[PDB]
């Protein structure tokens, strides 16, 4: 039930080479595997939460 969708990473008239990225698949960023997000994390207890 997850959504698989491709988004174009190129623009009209762009020069591409052999094996160059055209569209990104699902869970990917610029051809790199994107399984999540990069967040600013602090390591510390908080009110027992």
């Amino acid at each position: 039930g997850t959504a698989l969708d491709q988004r174009p990473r190129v623009v009209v008239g762009q020069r591409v080479r052999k094996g160059d990225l055209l569209a990104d698949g699902p869970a990917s960023e610029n051809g790199f595997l994107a399984l999540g997000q990069n967040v600013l994390v602090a390591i510390m207890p908080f009110d027992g939460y």
Binding site: M44, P45, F46, D47, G48
Partner: protein, 52 residues
């Protein structure tokens, strides 16, 4: 009674606090020990976050 229960000359840890809970159960009964548990929880957490 509280003053009697606590071991003041020692840092509080799992065993001392467990002993505290048990003694509190024996002396003060269920309800008061429950309240003490909630208090220990609250202040424990509160200090745990700011402790660094």
């Amino acid at each position: 009674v509280a003053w009697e229960l606590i071991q003041l000359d020692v840092p509080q840890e799992k065993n001392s606090l467990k002993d505290l809970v048990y003694q509190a159960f024996l002396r003060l009964g269920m309800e008061k020990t429950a309240r003490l548990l909630d208090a220990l929880k609250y202040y424990g957490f509160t200090f745990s976050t700011t402790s660094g």
